[PDB]
Design an enzyme around this catalytic site. Structure first.
Site, short mmCIF file in Angstrom:
data_model
loop_
_atom_site.label_atom_id
_atom_site.label_comp_id
_atom_site.label_asym_id
_atom_site.label_seq_id
_atom_site.Cartn_x
_atom_site.Cartn_y
_atom_site.Cartn_z
N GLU A 1 0.88 -1.06 -0.16
CA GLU A 1 -0.29 0.28 -0.01
C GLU A 1 0.51 1.16 0.52
O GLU A 1 0.49 2.55 0.31
CB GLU A 1 -0.92 -0.06 1.51
CG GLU A 1 -2.23 -1.69 1.02
CD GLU A 1 -3.57 -1.45 -0.15
OE1 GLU A 1 -3.24 0.30 -0.27
OE2 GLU A 1 -3.78 -1.95 0.37
N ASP B 1 -6.91 6.01 -5.06
CA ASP B 1 -6.29 4.92 -5.24
C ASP B 1 -6.01 4.92 -6.50
O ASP B 1 -6.33 5.75 -8.35
CB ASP B 1 -6.61 4.26 -4.59
CG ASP B 1 -7.89 3.40 -4.78
OD1 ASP B 1 -8.88 3.74 -5.62
OD2 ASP B 1 -8.76 2.45 -4.08
N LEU C 1 -9.29 3.81 3.08
CA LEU C 1 -10.04 3.73 1.62
C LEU C 1 -11.31 5.12 2.50
O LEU C 1 -10.91 4.43 3.79
CB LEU C 1 -10.92 3.28 1.02
CG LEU C 1 -12.37 4.07 0.00
CD1 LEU C 1 -11.98 4.18 -1.17
CD2 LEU C 1 -13.01 2.68 0.55
N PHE D 1 -8.22 -6.96 2.75
CA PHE D 1 -8.09 -5.62 3.09
C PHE D 1 -7.80 -5.00 2.13
O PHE D 1 -8.28 -3.41 1.86
CB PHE D 1 -6.72 -5.34 3.74
CG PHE D 1 -5.74 -3.89 3.92
CD1 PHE D 1 -5.39 -3.01 3.38
CD2 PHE D 1 -5.98 -3.58 5.41
CE1 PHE D 1 -4.99 -2.24 3.48
CE2 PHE D 1 -5.10 -2.54 5.83
CZ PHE D 1 -5.03 -1.63 4.60
N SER E 1 -11.89 -20.66 -6.07
CA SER E 1 -10.49 -20.20 -5.35
C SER E 1 -10.29 -20.48 -3.55
O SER E 1 -9.42 -21.70 -3.24
CB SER E 1 -9.61 -19.25 -5.15
OG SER E 1 -9.59 -18.72 -7.04
N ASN F 1 -6.20 -20.51 -10.20
CA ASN F 1 -7.30 -19.45 -10.87
C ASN F 1 -7.80 -18.27 -10.03
O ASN F 1 -8.18 -17.96 -10.06
CB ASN F 1 -8.71 -21.09 -9.28
CG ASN F 1 -10.05 -20.05 -9.57
OD1 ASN F 1 -10.04 -20.22 -8.45
ND2 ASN F 1 -10.61 -20.77 -9.96
#
Ligand SMILES: [Cl-]
Ligand SMILES: [Cl-]
Length: 162
Positions: A11, A20, A32, A104, A117, A132
């Site tokens: 990040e 972002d 965010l 996250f 998955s 996948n």
């Protein structure tokens, strides 16, 4: 290496409002603020999160505090999620970190969508899961991060981060 360090690499750290990879107002370490197009709305959400008149700027300590909250909320969110918890519970320490990173980034909901998955992961079919997981918008839009997280699930090591 640990989750915090992992996410800090993924990040970054920015002390001033920024947009972002999707164009949404963010600050700190991936926090965010809002999906609205309005910068005022974002400044407002910021002041409300920090508890002061920030003017769109925070300190390192404030960023780290939001970060601690967000990591904890993500863990707590996985644990409360009927679709996520069993996966998380079935994983080793390193791989759990990979699941946390995804939640996250994309939220519990978004991750919850990787049903096939998740099932592969829960079955410990690492190579199949990795393939996948790659067939996804996530991978096509942020392929470098995606590859680091997928490597972590494939291997169970932090090699992708060293
Ligand atoms: Cl908050
Ligand atoms: Cl990327």
């Amino acid at each position: 290496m640990n989750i915090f360090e992992m996410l800090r690499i993924d990040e970054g750290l920015r002390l001033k409002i920024y947009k972002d990879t999707e164009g949404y107002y963010t600050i700190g370490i991936g926090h965010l603020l809002t999906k609205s197009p309005s910068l005022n709305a974002a400044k407002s959400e910021l002041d409300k999160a920090i508890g002061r008149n920030t003017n769109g700027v925070i300190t390192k300590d404030e960023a780290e505090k939001l970060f601690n909250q967000d990591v904890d909320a993500a863990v707590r969110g996985i644990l409360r999620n009927a679709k996520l918890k069993p996966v998380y519970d079935s994983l080793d320490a390193v791989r759990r970190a990979a699941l946390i990173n995804m939640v996250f980034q994309m939220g519990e909901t978004g991750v919850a969508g990787f049903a096939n998955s998740l099932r592969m992961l829960q079955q410990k079919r690492w190579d199949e899961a990795a393939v996948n997981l790659a067939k996804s918008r996530w991978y096509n839009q942020t392929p470098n991060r995606a590859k680091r997280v997928i490597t972590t699930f494939r291997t169970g090591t932090w090699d992708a981060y060293k």
